[PDB]
């Protein structure tokens, strides 16, 4: 068949690209040293490095390492410092939030103090990383879209861990640090407050998540299908329209009756992705503080379905009949 442009047929390699610079003097803080990986060169660029070292990046790295080490050493001490049993039960361990009886007060190290210290370090690390992503775009003389979309996810992060426990008045409302233990928190949160399906903001969040995955499938396929016209060079197509953009627009116009531009599709993508954590955080913040049972709320607002048939197995079959006796 025709070439489909999924893996590159042949690779070429030249001198390493050290990057652009301006009066801001970015070269001062950049590391020296690059590598080439031929395995990842089949799908994308092969060059590895260099990287930018600032104050925000170093602070974020140190605080994140501290948070990781605190969680890990607590998990190790919880098992008796036995390494084989630490490995055997890795997915089941966690560092647990404090008990409900302490409110917002500082608990003992045995019953949530380490949890609070680790949470403080993680918060510092994430905020420092956001500051770094803002500063880099400021020094490159570009727009601030990356920082604003990272801030939309940080909103749901903060609502889950900081704002809602303060509004409810207890640090015991936060999420435990563990793999199976945080999936237990998700299910228990859904059960405790009725049914999270009947939360309209959870439904809006699902709408936007599904839509973003659908949009990425569409955009990736469309750009790969017009690459024979040089379609992957999107910026030059924005500055000087070519036949790739026209064919890409006309496909969707003839398919569903309307289309986009080469620059306008990225606005659609940016909004569908960012709208997911915003609606999610609004939905989470309203639970427990305003609404305590979402199914009863749905019954009150008349969008809960009604069923006529009966419940129980004896209305449909017999115990002997199921067993085959």
């Amino acid at each position: 068949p025709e070439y489909q442009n999924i893996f590159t047929q042949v690779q070429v390699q030249g001198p390493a690209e050290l990057g652009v610079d301006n009066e801001n003097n970015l070269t001062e803080e950049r590391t020296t040293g690059t590598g080439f990986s031929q395995l990842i060169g089949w799908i994308g660029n092969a060059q590895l490095g260099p990287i930018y070292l600032g104050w925000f990046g170093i602070i974020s790295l140190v605080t994140g390492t501290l948070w990781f080490n605190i969680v890990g050493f607590n998990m190790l001490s919880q098992v008796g410092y036995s390494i084989p049993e630490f490995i055997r039960q890795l997915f089941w361990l966690a560092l647990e939030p404090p008990s409900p009886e302490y409110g917002l007060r500082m608990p003992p190290l045995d019953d949530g103090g380490w949890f609070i210290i680790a949470s403080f370090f993680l918060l510092v690390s994430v905020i420092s990383w956001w500051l770094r992503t803002y500063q880099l775009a400021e020094m490159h003389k570009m727009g601030k879209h990356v920082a604003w979309a990272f801030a939309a996810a940080i909103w749901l992060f903060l609502v889950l861990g900081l704002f809602r426990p303060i509004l409810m008045g207890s640090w015991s409302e936060a999420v435990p640090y563990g793999i199976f233990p945080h999936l237990d928190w998700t299910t228990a949160f859904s059960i405790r407050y009725g049914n999270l399906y009947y939360n309209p903001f959870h439904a809006l969040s699902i709408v936007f998540l599904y839509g973003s995955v659908l949009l990425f499938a569409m955009h990736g396929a469309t750009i790969l299908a017009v690459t024979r016209f040089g379609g992957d060079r999107e910026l030059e197509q924005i500055y000087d329209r070519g036949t790739a953009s026209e064919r890409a627009g006309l496909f969707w116009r003839w398919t569903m009756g309307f289309n986009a531009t080469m620059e306008g599709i990225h606005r659609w993508a940016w909004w569908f992705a960012v709208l997911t954590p915003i609606t999610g955080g609004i939905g989470i913040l309203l639970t427990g503080t305003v609404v305590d049972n979402w199914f009863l709320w749905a019954v009150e607002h008349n969008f809960a379905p009604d069923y006529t048939q009966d419940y129980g197995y004896e209305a449909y079959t017999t115990y002997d009949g199921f067993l085959g006796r």
């Binding site: 419940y311 197995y313 449909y316 199921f322």
Partner: protein, 51 residues
């Protein structure tokens, strides 16, 4: 004695058989494997609520 027909008029012999072969050998036979992979373990279900 007709070698003056083949050498004079040449195409591709193996193109249509490759179609037949990628149709049955391909689709039909593999379908069998996939169905006969999960269905050998039959299951029965008991209803406890409305349809």
């Amino acid at each position: 004695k007709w070698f003056d027909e083949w050498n004079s008029k040449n195409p591709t012999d193996i193109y249509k058989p490759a179609i037949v072969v990628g149709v049955a050998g391909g689709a039909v036979f593999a379908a069998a494997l996939l169905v006969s992979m999960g269905q050998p373990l039959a299951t029965d279900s008991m209803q406890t609520g409305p349809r």
